Amino acid sequence: DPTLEWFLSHCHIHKYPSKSTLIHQGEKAETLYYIVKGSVAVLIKDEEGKEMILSYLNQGDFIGELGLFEEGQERSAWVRAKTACEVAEISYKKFRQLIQVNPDILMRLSAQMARRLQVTSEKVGNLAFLDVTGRIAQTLLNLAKQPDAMTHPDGMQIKITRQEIGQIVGCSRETVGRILKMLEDQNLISAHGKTIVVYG
Amino acid sequence: DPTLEWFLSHCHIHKYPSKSTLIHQGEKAETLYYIVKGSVAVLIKDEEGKEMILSYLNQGDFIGELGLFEEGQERSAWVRAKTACEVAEISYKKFRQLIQVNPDILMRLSAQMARRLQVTSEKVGNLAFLDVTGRIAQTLLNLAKQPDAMTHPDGMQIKITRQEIGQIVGCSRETVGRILKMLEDQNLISAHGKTIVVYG
DNA sequence: ATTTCGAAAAATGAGAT
DNA sequence: CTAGATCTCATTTTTCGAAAT
DNA sequence: ATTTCGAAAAATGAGAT
DNA sequence: CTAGATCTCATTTTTCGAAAT
Numbered sequence A, B: 001d002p003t004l005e006w007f008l009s010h011c012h013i014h015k016y017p018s019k020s021t022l023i024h025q026g027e028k029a030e031t032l033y034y035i036v037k038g039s040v041a042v043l044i045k046d047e048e049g050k051e052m053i054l055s056y057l058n059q060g061d062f063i064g065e066l067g068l069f070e071e072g073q074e075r076s077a078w079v080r081a082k083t084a085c086e087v088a089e090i091s092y093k094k095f096r097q098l099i100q101v102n103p104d105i106l107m108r109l110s111a112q113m114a115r116r117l118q119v120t121s122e123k124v125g126n127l128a129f130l131d132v133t134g135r136i137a138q139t140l141l142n143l144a145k146q147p148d149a150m151t152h153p154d155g156m157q158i159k160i161t162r163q164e165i166g167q168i169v170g171c172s173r174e175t176v177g178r179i180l181k182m183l184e185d186q187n188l189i190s191a192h193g194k195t196i197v198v199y200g
Numbered sequence C, E: 001a002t003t004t005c006g007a008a009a010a011a012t013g014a015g016a017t
Numbered sequence D, F: 001c002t003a004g005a006t007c008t009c010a011t012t013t014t015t016c017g018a019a020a021t
């Protein structure tokens, strides 16, 4: 499209190898990122180092957008590379300028912020309203919504570990394992290792 | 300041009494809200009617924006008045106009969004990494800092039910009652009825 | 506005499970 | 194993409308 | 350099508390 | 109550960098 080609123009693209950290919590922020290629995982930790995945951000998604509206803001989370990422970087000071001339670019940003809020909100609900099974069924549907989600005649096909699912719903790897089978025993999903198939 | 009075100048003011419903989750968004005076409660329900309090919004806070970025969108949650409010309402299409005769108004709304995401994200953390005592402990401290709290000789004072408190930390009223008594045993607060004093 | 007075509606705890 | 969830009524606390200050 | 392969590692399955 | 967390061990799957092609 128009504007987005112009934006990237003034961005300083960089490379990040999968599993490398792109953003640190507590970090002072002055940089707005943009994922041109690759995918990351937005995540937070408890005082024990334990970690929860807040979301996954793929291509065309903005990163570290939060510290852009107030002075002295710190990164609210970590943002790790899941695959090899190709991300465009630009300072807050500069980005704010790209808006002056064409506020259509902030409209793209705001729209994405809006969406995240809906999902993060829906997430808080699941957390209080559903049990691990409910939370797991839900997260499975969400994983089938991801771009790196392949296809299967039985439905959609994803690749992820019981370990990782637990960091998403906030339960144990055991609990996930117990429940995963329980779902397979009702032909709703086809589990076999690090691969899950959601019959849909 | 200008940007706002010029904003209101194009809005249609409405008044709602305490406890009335301003937004019904599920309905089609086509309107925007700005709380000129008073305060509201953002909340979600489950099929069984259980209610969860995502947030409290107050004077100067925008409402009903999540739908403003994409076509065919539904209100994400219910919004019910806490106190009597005087709200400014404007259409999406009428707002899309203003944003292009001064995008400074968009920047300002995006700013409130960014903040709600930090906050909602933090809520995700709490639910996962904290025991009910901790979350409740956390809530009182916050509520104690809400614009509608009352100064107290020994601290800040608030009026809220155990019921409601459980709708913010996600747990039953029974548990909020029990934990409440222990926080008093520890001379951390004094709870008489719905009035709770949070010792400075 | 708000302090009062009598319902009527809400919100609680107790302790068993 | 164990934080908490639930379920039940008998009991408080509040809320709400009308009335006066 | 890119591809094939057999340990260490990471991820799980089980069963008791 | 009772959904899930923890712990311990023993087995499977993956991850990966040495070696190979």
Ligand SMILES: Nc1ncnc2c1ncn2[C@@H]1O[C@@H]2COP(=O)(O)O[C@H]2[C@H]1O
Pocket (backbone or CB within 6 Å): A023, A029, A042, A054, A055, A057, A062, A063, A064, A065, A066, A067, A074, A075, A076, A077, A078, A079, A116, A120, B117, B121
């Ligand atoms: N709930 C969320 N959903 C998606 N992305 C998020 C969420 N919370 C934080 N982030 C991203 O993680 C980044 C962490 O640093 P910033 O606060 O600068 O910007 C944040 C967002 O870009």
Ligand SMILES: Nc1ncnc2c1ncn2[C@@H]1O[C@@H]2COP(=O)(O)O[C@H]2[C@H]1O
Pocket (backbone or CB within 6 Å): A117, A121, B023, B029, B042, B054, B055, B062, B063, B064, B065, B066, B067, B068, B074, B075, B076, B077, B078, B079, B116, B120
């Ligand atoms: N997590 C949240 N925090 C604060 N406000 C919210 C949250 N989720 C939804 N809202 C508000 O509630 C509104 C529900 O309908 P909309 O989606 O139009 O817009 C939403 C926001 O104005």
